[PDB]
Amino acid sequence: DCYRGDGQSYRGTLSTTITGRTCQSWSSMTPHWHRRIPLYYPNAGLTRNYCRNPDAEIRPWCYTMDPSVRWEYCNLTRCP
Amino acid sequence: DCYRGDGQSYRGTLSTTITGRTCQSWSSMTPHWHRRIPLYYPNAGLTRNYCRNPDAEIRPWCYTMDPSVRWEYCNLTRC
């Protein structure tokens, strides 16, 4: 599994961060309250807890299930 | 008056930061808008402007009344 460019187009199902943490669901505010919700980013594919890039970071990312770690990049490599 | 561990259990009355600033009230959104509110933290004892640790910081903290400084650790020692 891989991403192209900055990964805004990435629509895979990876839900694990670079440090092995589980992604938080985009539709949950727990443990991290956020504004990266389907209502505000309807074309960004904010499904379940999948790694995404709704706000033009360098690569796909997610909020994490670890209360002490708000968000991280995903364990995902750049495409050949 | 002191905290144990990471101070998630702290329920004392200290309301002052490690720089001497006064804590903002948890129920207040001014000068700092936030979501450390009883709705998302029912167990956290978020009362008045008391130093608390709802969200697993390393020690009790509060939003500060200084508009320049969003939040700081509290002037509290470990038991």
Added chain:
Amino acid sequence: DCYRGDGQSYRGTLSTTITGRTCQSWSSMTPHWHRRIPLYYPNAGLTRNYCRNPDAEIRPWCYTMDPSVRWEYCNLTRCP
């Protein structure tokens, strides 16, 4: 074109950050959702996308048109 004190009083028309990005409009909620609007800061001169200091930063600042970069200080030096 410069700021006095920490620039709370500043009402010039600069709309460019330190890294040369352009300010988002204060009334606009896109790309960054925020609280710094005419309602919650009534005397701050939150007009168009002009560099302001309503919330007691060290210097005037703005939210940026870059969706990733939330806010930056403006390219404005202090008055001599």
